[PDB]
Amino acid sequence: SVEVEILLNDAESRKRAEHKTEDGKKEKYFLFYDGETVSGKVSLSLKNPNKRLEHQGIKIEFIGQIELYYDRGNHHEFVSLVKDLARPGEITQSQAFDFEFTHVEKPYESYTGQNVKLRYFLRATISRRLNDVVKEMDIVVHTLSTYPSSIKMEVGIEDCLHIEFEYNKSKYHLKDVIVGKIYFLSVEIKIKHMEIDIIKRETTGTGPNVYHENDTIAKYEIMDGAPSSIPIRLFLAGYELTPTMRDINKKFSVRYYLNLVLIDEEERRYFKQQEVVLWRKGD
């Protein structure tokens, strides 16, 4: 009956960003930043030239919401703007409606996680008595930051094992390099295996319950049984990363840890982790 397009102004002038969806495919979407105007037209196309399409109003919505997967039906919208475009009447000919939302809050970066998702979109709705004709276009929001020593974590016992890992920053942007060093300062026990991991922790807190998902993003191994130092370089640009997301509207958190891991000859596991704040640098 009807075909609804949402078209942005300066479509071919504005930037698109890649974003992975719940499936796993990466699509490109219109990138937007906090505050920016969202504006364009809702375009209607009459499939049958020769046919009235009656309705109870046409409207465009800008929505920013958090969707918790353990409660999939119950969306938590943190920004909702509503502009009505037509009163109940009827469409007798393909036409379009201008809309503009000046000053659109977008406080948080789009995120497509394991137990949670945060998205922004425009929703055009043609109300009808039977079934509403509804069209959604997702857009992507990014949050840019801007920032400015040495950080150490260590592992082991008290007299037989002391390993020290040092690295340049407590904060890194998504294209940075983690530059550090492993110091074998005490090794009275044979080390069977050792690695540095970058781990993503998603923490989603749906009602009385919280959910936790760890994802090992990067795993850098330390070789051969002759434990001196060893320089470390982790190239962040290699890996799918998002900025740190902390207590987003108290629904979820995405945080990143350096995970130092060490297995001795008795097979004992030694762990230590420290949080690194990731941020997004503006191209």
Swiss-Prot record:
Transmembrane residue ranges: none
Any Pfam family hit: Vps26
Record-level GO cellular component terms: cytosol; early endosome; glutamatergic synapse; late endosome; phagocytic vesicle; postsynaptic early endosome; postsynaptic recycling endosome; retromer complex
Task of the protein: Acts as a component of the retromer cargo-selective complex (CSC). The CSC is believed to be the core functional component of retromer or respective retromer complex variants acting to prevent missorting of selected transmembrane cargo proteins into the lysosomal degradation pathway. The recruitment of the CSC to the endosomal membrane involves RAB7A and SNX3. The SNX-BAR retromer mediates retrograde transport of cargo proteins from endosomes to the trans-Golgi network (TGN) and is involved in endosome-to-plasma membrane transport for cargo protein recycling.
Keywords: Cytoplasm, Endosome, Membrane, Phosphoprotein, Protein transport, Transport
Membrane topology (UniProt): Peripheral membrane protein
Protein name (database record): Vacuolar protein sorting-associated protein 26B
UniProt superkingdom: Eukaryota
Organism: Mus musculus (Mouse)
Keyword Repressor: no
Family per record: Belongs to the VPS26 family.
Main localization category: cytoplasm
The keyword Cytoplasm is assigned to this record: yes
Organs and tissues of expression: Ubiquitously expressed in developing embryo and adult. Highly expressed in brain.
A biological-process GO annotation: regulation of neurotransmitter receptor localization to postsynaptic specialization membrane
Disulfide bonds: none
Entry's localization field: Cytoplasm; Membrane; Early endosome; Late endosome
Quaternary data: Component of the heterotrimeric retromer cargo-selective complex (CSC), also described as vacuolar protein sorting subcomplex (VPS), formed by VPS26 (VPS26A or VPS26B), VPS29 and VPS35. The CSC has a highly elongated structure with VPS26 and VPS29 binding independently at opposite distal ends of VPS35 as central platform. The CSC is believed to associate with variable sorting nexins to form functionally distinct retromer complex variants.
